[PDB]
Amino acid sequence: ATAAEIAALPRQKVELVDPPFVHAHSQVAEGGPKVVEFTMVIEEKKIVIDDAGTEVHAMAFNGTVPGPLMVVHQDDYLELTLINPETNTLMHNIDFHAATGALGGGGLTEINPGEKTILRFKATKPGVFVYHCAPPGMVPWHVVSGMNGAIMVLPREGLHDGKGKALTYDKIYYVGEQDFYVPRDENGKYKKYEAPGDAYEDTVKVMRTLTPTHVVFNGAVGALTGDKAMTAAVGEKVLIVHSQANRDTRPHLIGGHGDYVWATGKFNTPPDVDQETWFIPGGAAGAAFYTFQQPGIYAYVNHNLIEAFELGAAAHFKVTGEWNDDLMTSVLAPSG
Amino acid sequence: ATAAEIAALPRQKVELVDPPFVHAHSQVAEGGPKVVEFTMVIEEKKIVIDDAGTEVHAMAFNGTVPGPLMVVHQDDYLELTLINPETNTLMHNIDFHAATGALGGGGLTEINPGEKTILRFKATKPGVFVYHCAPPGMVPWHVVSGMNGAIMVLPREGLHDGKGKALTYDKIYYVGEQDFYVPRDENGKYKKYEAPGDAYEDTVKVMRTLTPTHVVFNGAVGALTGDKAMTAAVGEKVLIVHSQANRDTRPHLIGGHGDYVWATGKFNTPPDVDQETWFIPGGAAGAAFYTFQQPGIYAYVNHNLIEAFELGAAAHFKVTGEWNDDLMTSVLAPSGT
């Protein structure tokens, strides 16, 4: 497309929402290609990541870890306004794995505190894709400070299975998984700091062990439980988008399955089916589609169970509806 | 199916066998859906995991690590009687990744010492699948104490390749891979504990390093070697089912291949072909089909070679038959330059 052709396309402004929710969108594209406009303000802020009051100096797109999910369709343009307020201390940028050129956009979006930038790219490939900050020389530090999220580029005709039949979800959730590397003092207590730069040297030492202290969904142990448990009903079709910008993960829905899983996150690669546990490499997003068949509590985990249940990588679903005794029944309940 | 319809189905009681062997079964289903009945007794037991005498307080379905492979066909029902004898100290349960609902069955099978339970589920999806114990609040500790195994849900028409051609194995082995996290004393020697509970806190510390001390097949370093090496012959078609309930692995047959590999373990997902090294994520089972073409000794390993050869993740195959010089020949044996 020429500059004039792009200038003539319709514009649509989207209001982002906090994960694990996803902003309003249509699965099947409404009309032809558009320039879809998003704005995010970067917030450097302390977050508390566990019940011991452990702190991270987060670097947070739109104020959350992960950053919010942006949804467009294939061959739309994504036009992001990125703002780094004067209240921040560091330069930031953005690299979209969905984009082509200039280090995913990072080379064109380096903004110091008090600056903003607008980047446009053509979403040429359908899938879920990571985005993350990547300042030269400080790349992993920003990413493991929570400065990452994902986008979804839907096919213009929505999702399909490997044989071209439509797959239409009722609900979508975005689970961003984060590895954190929190320094500890000689007595094993997590250290606190009063500026992001103060934590840098100590954090790099932990990073270099390749052993996270915490592995969490939505920025904290237990974040996607209780008041923030995900919900569904028996019969409901749910898409779970999952990202990890730095480290491998292996998602699993305890009591469920991934009926269709785009484990590589790319919709032109046919989905795996009937999955127990799928695998998403560090630096990628994946997506799983499931139709709930039983009510009750589910856990959704990284199935390194030490990572899930010692380090924090566990969420819950609460599912309403009627129990199916054909699928499962207790013939003899626990008894003497 | 209604309660009355399920009640009318034939029942078949199966006797489990110890890994790496698999109980007798038919690849293609015989007749219509059945309720296939299994029983396992849980044993908390001390096991030795290396030649030095290192001990683990194992938590073992049917007394083995891994637990035994249960085999059914798609749309059969698996009906497990699970018994937690009064000689044990902990509550246990079972989560079948093959099942749908109640945390895989774990929510319906919590049994204290002196209790039993019977769970039935419909095996709706074909593949190999992990099962493991999962007591709320103590999940990884039970799993990395060996309390895991796998099942195989065969398609009713047996296995096929990605293009509808039948794949019929001559024999099947189940390799359960276990990551252990054994505490060490200040000399760097592995610790022993009088009771299983005594090891908990020290073990959790090792677990949090995400670095196992041992990575083993069939419960111990060298367990599938020597007189316990797996066997095959030139021309023989072997299915190797491999599980890892907690941690990633990357199986490889040294001197062979995975001709067809269901790396995700799910038979409706077409297999990869001609594989050198495949990948099974923690929390899953996979399966590889190979026709042997050369005789001799093979090693079957996790191809993180440190894990294989330092930490224990190596098994052997002994293979009979005639050497094939077309496939490989020593043109010049090691000799002076």
Add this chain to the structure above:
Amino acid sequence: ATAAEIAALPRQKVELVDPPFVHAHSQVAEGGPKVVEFTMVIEEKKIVIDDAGTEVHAMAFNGTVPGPLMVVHQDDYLELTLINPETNTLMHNIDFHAATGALGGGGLTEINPGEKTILRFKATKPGVFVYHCAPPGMVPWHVVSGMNGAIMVLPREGLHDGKGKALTYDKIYYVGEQDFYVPRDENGKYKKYEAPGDAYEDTVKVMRTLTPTHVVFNGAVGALTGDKAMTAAVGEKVLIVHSQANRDTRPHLIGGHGDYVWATGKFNTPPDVDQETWFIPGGAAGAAFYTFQQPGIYAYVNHNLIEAFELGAAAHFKVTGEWNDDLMTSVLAPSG
């Protein structure tokens, strides 16, 4: 084939080229099956792997880490003369993952210093495959000392996508990724040793932590950056073969994609498409095909970004040509 038929096949000697470059070959096979002859001399030598003078006693096929890429076609034979000079002090051998029998060749090629051997095997399966030294009882030590490379067994009709359309590359590079485990003294300084064996016990202790001290491409931090960046042009089709003989990796082209990725490395397994980050398990090779669409500097990394930017696993591509503003444009450059 009969004995006389095998004996009648043409024999052809090929001169090897150091990674990341690849020796002369045709994508579509020229003529019928051949016995393709290669020679490699093993070199034990101290190499410096980082900017701080850190040494490894490398064990190097053909003198390089990784060893060179050998290229044949399916149903050719690969006939390797492997030489272990008398100046070396260890026994070595070779295991081809592409080969069938005798532990991939390792059982037939155990050569002490002052010995040579010639192994022939039929390349029955198309793909990229690891090769590595594997002396019984010291396998990981040789491999993580750099004694590994890869081969490519092309289909006789060249590469194809999943729909049977030809994929013809303009150039090919081989990126061998190496995990090193360098001992440190109690002050955290890397240790040096007189002879390879002197380092054995200390190195195995580091290996058993499963935490490399360095993760590098082409044998050193920065070996494929700066003036040793790989090159391409807009419009050029590039195949990037990547291997890791011991440990998982997750390659990613920053600013690009894997348009077609044989993530398992095997050409009869259909390639994934539109990949952001692909996954190659330890003990395997993979290959990615990409058509460059934007000029500039790209980084090519293991997308555990700590591994990439703290431990060494980052390469560059320098790409010439015209910028494409349709694909990406800075609507508003960074500004107040």
